Structures are given as structure tokens and as C-alpha cells.
């Protein structure tokens, strides 16, 4: 009764698992560990300062932003960075995970690994 | 009954809106979107590694720190940075929003835009 | 009844105080202010991108990661950085505070000061 599990599918067919815990008027969502995204999962694979991961699945998830430590692997480099992440729903009802970064690079993302991320808050 | 709205005024006459949600012994405060501060809103407009925004308004707000992604516009540059922010009350009862940054610059702030910020926690 | 106080000891004999607040199924832990660690407190004092602080004390603390602003003093430099921190328990039941950073440096930590840190969440 405390929690529910859910998931999303990425464009490349990856599964993002999460668990939601209701704490009265708020919900805390924790993502599954060892999450890795391919460049193919992003709307654009360019390593921009705003990245969009379109999602599919059964239930919307709309959150405040949370801090993550991510690793971005490009052909030539490895970038280890604190980023902010947020689950948002599009005007077309399409769920997205948005990743906000400090510095745009003219490089293509091969992988993004989430090392660790703070729990996500939603105000229900 | 769950929440209350409040606001602060900045030195330049800007309005910071917020909504507070009580979750038993804690309060979660969410700031209004699209917040932009002028250099004139800071105690000092120099782009120091600690920035202070003095506030006026009806009710104190004292919080733990939260992470934000901010944009700092100076005459010559645009800096997009993760920062920590915290609402604190001064020894004189003056409320402040404090912004803590990584790197002091000898430049004057024209604008600070909050792109996104994690909710603020207070332990009541 | 709302809270409990606890502490850990560091290798150099420093005391980390904390206060835990239960909010139904979650616990919020706030660390004592003015925390300073010596290089001697780390498993390795090299300024790596993952730092481990072994702890002793009466009660495990297992948390999600939280953002901190830290100052790292080395012989030659002062680094002011946002980092993520997390309390984890080892396979041997040894509690650790882990600090995750962006950039490894081939320098020895003299001190790490926590300037400010977001509260820690545990899902009980
Ligand atoms: Cl797409
Ligand atoms: Cl994108
Ligand atoms: Cl966060
Ligand atoms: Cl590339
Ligand atoms: Cl002033
Ligand atoms: Cl200032
Ligand atoms: Cl935060
Ligand atoms: Cl300037
Ligand atoms: Cl050790
Ligand atoms: Cl270490
Ligand atoms: Cl955090
Ligand atoms: Cl050194």
C-alpha cells in the first residue's frame, strides 16, 4: 500500500524501473540502479546543455528537478558531471526525462550513465 | 489546509512567489517559475562565490540548502552553473536568499536566472 | 518521539553528529554544521573522484545521495566544488560516507570542509 513500481521504455528499448512512495501529499520516486542510456535514446544525441529522453509507458511521472552525477561517453572523451534531471510531460502527453547540463559540446553522446541521483519529488 | 502561498520583495521591487506544503513535521517549499534577479537585487553585484539577496515580506522562511541550475549574465559572459541556494534569516531578523557558487569572478552580475531548482526543505 | 540524535567517529577521532526525523515511511537526516574532515579520515587521501570515509558508531545509516558544496584543501590549492554524498554500509557491515566528485587530481587531501549539504533521505 505504501509504494508502487512502474517502468518506462526508451527509444532503444531500454527499461527504466522506478518505485514510488507516497508520503501523504507528496510522492518520492527512486530510480532503479545501474541506469545507462544510449545516444539513440535522446531526441538529439548531440551533447547539448539540455538533453531530452522521450519515454513510453503506462503512467505519467511529473517531478521537481533532482541532482545526478552522470558520466557522458563520447567517441573521444569521458565527462563526469553533476547535472539536474526532471520528469516532465509534453503538450502531446509524451513523457520525457530532461537532463540539464552546464556546458554544450559539439560531440555525439555514445552513452550516459547515471552514477547516483537524489530521489525525485512529486507534489500530488 | 495542506499548503500556503507567500511572497518576498527584492530590492529592485521584484516578487518571489512560493508555495509551502506541510508534510507532518517538515515543510516543502516550491518557488515560482521563471525567476530572474537583477544585479541590483544582490547585497553586492560582484560575481562572488557567495551571493546574498536581501528580502522583505511577511513571514520568515528558513530552509536547508537546495541545488539549482542558474544562468549568470555579465556584460561579457554567460555562465551556466549548478549552485546551492538557501533561505536564511539574519541576526537582525532580515530574510536572505543565499546563493553559493564554486568560482568567484571579478565581474558584475547583470542578471541571474534560475533555470530549475530542487524543492526547499524546512524542519518545523 | 519525532527525532533521534546519533553520531559517528572518524579514523582521526572526529565526531560527526546528526539528527534523524521520521516522516512516516521516510527518515530525513541532517548533519551537524561546521564539518571538517582530515586527509587521515579517508580510506585514501588522494583527491580521487570517489572518496571513502570509514565510520564507527552504534547505528547504521543508509541514505540516498545528497548534494553538498565542499572545500578541498591540498598543499597547493583550494577547490570549491559541488559533490554528491551518500551514507552506505559495506559488505562487512562497516558504515562509510562516500563523496563523489567530477575530477580526479593527483594531490593529497589535507582537509575537506562541508560548506552546506542538502538533507539526507532514507526510505525505512
Ligand atoms: Cl525522438
Ligand atoms: Cl536531446
Ligand atoms: Cl537534488
Ligand atoms: Cl562526437
Ligand atoms: Cl543590500
Ligand atoms: Cl551579494
Ligand atoms: Cl537539492
Ligand atoms: Cl563585469
Ligand atoms: Cl581506512
Ligand atoms: Cl578515499
Ligand atoms: Cl540533493
Ligand atoms: Cl598534494
Residue numbers in the entry:
A (entry chain A), B (entry chain A), C (entry chain A): 327 to 450
Paper passage:
Adenovirus fibres are trimeric proteins, which consists of three different domains: an N-terminal penton base binding domain, a thin central shaft domain and a C-terminal globular fibre head domain. Adenovirus infections are usually initiated by the interaction of their fibre heads with primary receptors, followed by internalization mediated by penton bases interacting with integrins. Here we present the structure of the raptor adenovirus 1 fibre head, which does not appear bind sialyllactose, and show that deletion of the beta-hairpin insertion does not significantly affect the stability of siadenovirus fibre head domains. Like the other siadenovirus fibre head structure, that of TAdV-3, the monomer has an ABCJ-GHID beta-sheet topology with kinked C- and J-strands resembling reovirus fibre head structures.
The beta-hairpin arms of the RAdV-1 and TAdV-3 fibre heads (residues 359-NYGLR VVNGE LQNTP-373 and 349-DNIGV IENPT FYRNK S-364, respectively) were replaced by a short fragment containing two amino acids (EF and VD in the structure of RAdV-1 and TAdV-3 fibre heads, respectively). Data to 1.7 Å resolution was collected from one of the crystals and processed. This structure could be solved by difference Fourier synthesis and directly refined, as the crystal form was isomorphous to the non-mutated fibre head. Structure superposition of the native RAdV-1 fibre head and the beta-hairpin arm deletion mutant showed that the main architecture is highly conserved, apart from the mutation introduced. The beta-hairpin arm is replaced by a short loop and the conformations of the BC- and HI-loops are slightly affected. In the trimeric form, the interaction interface of the mutant RAdV-1 fibre head now only contains hydrophobic interactions involving fourteen amino acids from each monomer, accounting for 11 % of all residues. Only seven intermonomer hydrogen bonds are present, although the intermolecular salt bridge is conserved. The mutated RAdV-1 fibre head trimer has a solvent accessible surface area of 16.9 × 103 Å2, with 5.9 × 103 Å2 of buried surface, which means that now only 25 % (instead of 33 %) of the total surface gets buried upon trimer formation. The thermal stability of the mutated RAdV-1 fibre head protein was assessed by a thermofluor experiment and compared to the native versions. Deletion of the beta-hairpin appears to destabilize the structure somewhat, because now some unfolding is observed at high temperature (dotted line in Fig. 3a). The somewhat lower unfolding temperature can be explained by the loss of hydrophobic interaction surface and some of the intermolecular hydrogen bonds made by the beta-hairpin arm, and is consistent with the assembly stability prediction.
